[PDB]
A paper describes a structure:
To further elucidate the mechanism, crystallographic experiments were performed. We obtained the complex crystals of SZ611-substrate 59 and SZ611-product 46 using the soaking methods as described in Material and Methods. SZ611 assembles into a homodimer structure with four α-helices and five-strand β-sheets in each monomer, forming a cavity that serves as a deep substrate-binding pocket, in which a substituent of substrate 59 or of product 46 can occur without steric repulsion. In contrast, product 46 was well-defined in the electron density map, including the phenyl group corresponding to that of substrate 59. The phenyl group is located in the hydrophobic local space formed by the hydrophobic residues of L71, L74 and F75, which were clearly defined in the electron density map. Two other essential mutations, Y53F and N55A, have well-defined electron density maps that together expand the hydrophobic local space, thereby leading to the preference of intramolecular cyclization reactions. The molecular architecture of substrate 46 in the binding pocket was mainly attributed to its multiple interactions with catalytic residues D101 and D132. Product 46 shares a similar conformation with substrate 59 considering the hydrogen-bonding networks of amines and hydroxyl groups with D132 and D101, which together predicts a pathway for the LEH-catalyzed selective desymmetrization reactions of oxetanes. In the catalytic reactions, residue D132 acts as a proton acceptor to promote the deprotonation of the amino group. The deprotonated N-atom then nucleophilically attacks the oxetane moiety, resulting in ring opening, followed by the protonation of the O-atom of the oxetane precursor with D101 as the proton donor.
We report an in silico strategy for the biocatalytic synthesis of chiral N- and O-heterocycles via Baldwin cyclization modes of hydroxy- and amino-substituted epoxides and oxetanes using the limonene epoxide hydrolase from Rhodococcus erythropolis. We turned to cofactor-independent limonene epoxide hydrolases (LEHs) that normally catalyze direct hydrolysis of epoxides by positioning and activating water at the active site. On the basis of the well-documented mechanism of ReLEH, a water molecular is positioned by H-bonds to N55 and Y53 while D132 abstracts a proton from the water, enabling a smooth nucleophilic attack on one of the substrate’s epoxide carbon center. We have rationally engineered the epoxide hydrolase ReLEH with construction of a general platform for Baldwin cyclization reactivity of hydroxy- and amino-epoxides and oxetanes.
Numbering used by the authors:
A (entry chain B): -4 to 149
B (entry chain A): 2 to 149
The structure:
């Protein structure tokens, strides 16, 4: 898809489905999640938190989880203090039992160093009545930190 | 090993960890087979046109490379247990949110590693398997580097 950020470029993985529909939404829950992926490039925790239920949680799995909407917003705002989401490409999206799975590459740029990295992520979303009750992203933190020279554990 | 606790964030939908399709059933059977630590048993599940990647490490393409890459992991690690909290699927992809209890043979240490994986199935055979997780957290937990 077009990322409207000319300094970024995402290559198609050899293993990624070529089908137009592979990363296209087939259900209402998948559509809301792709809408949320599109919103991530705002880098605005106060806009993004509107997608979440009060009883919710967030975890970038190499780092500790945040429970409840206030903590999720605070945690997302903290990440946006040091990183910009420049682009998101979702190669595969699927869903079952109220969970949505996204296999993606996020182009992330470390604001303190100016360096960016194309990060392989597999994430899961739990939705209750169209609102996010859980979001967990799985990926390797070290390879990101080393590419952008930004340790994130503390 | 001791019982693997359900995470606080796990779904309480009683079907979340159950297979709903024949492909999901195959993937759960494959998860059961992992504790064999036996690449020759595991490769029976794979198509000739296939791939495997533990995402922090380089991929293996084709059934022969996949078997040899899994056998190589088994030279240093035992899979002592696998607990699949969530399984779902769409469009021939099966997703598994899991904890794998992995033990490093050189150190004897074990860690309950959080993993999200995707499997591609064609005609009941695995044509792709990619696991996403934090490699450093595992390496530091069991005192076993896997990426120099
Ligand atoms: O794009 C959404 C994520 C994100 C990135 C940047 C700012 C907010 C949110 C959530 C988890 N994802 C992985 C990640 C977390 C922490 C550090 C590095 C990677 C990326
Ligand atoms: O349990 C199946 C996996 C596995 C583990 C151990 C031996 C063979 C296979 C497949 C890759 N998975 C990710 C992984 C790779 C290397 C180190 C830690 C995690 C785990
Ligand atoms: Na689709
Ligand atoms: Na299920
Ligand atoms: Na589905």
């Amino acid at each position: 898809h077009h990322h409207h950020h000319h300094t970024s470029k995402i290559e198609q993985p050899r293993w990624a489905s070529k089908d137009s529909a592979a990363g296209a939404a087939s259900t209402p829950d998948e559509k809301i999640v792709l809408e949320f992926m599109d919103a991530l490039t705002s880098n605005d925790a106060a806009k993004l938190i509107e997608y979440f239920a009060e009883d919710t949680m967030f975890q970038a799995m190499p780092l500790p989880p945040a429970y409840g909407r206030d903590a999720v917003e605070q945690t997302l705002a903290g990440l946006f203090t040091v990183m910009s989401i420049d682009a998101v490409e979702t190669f595969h999206i699927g869903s079952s039992n109220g969970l949505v799975y996204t296999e993606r590459v996020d182009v992330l740029r470390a604001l303190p160093t100016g360096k960016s990295y194309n990060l392989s992520i597999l994430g899961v979303f739990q939705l209750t009545e169209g609102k996010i009750t859980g979001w967990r992203d799985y990926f390797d933190l070290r390879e990101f930190e080393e590419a952008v020279d930004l340790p994130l554990r503390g």
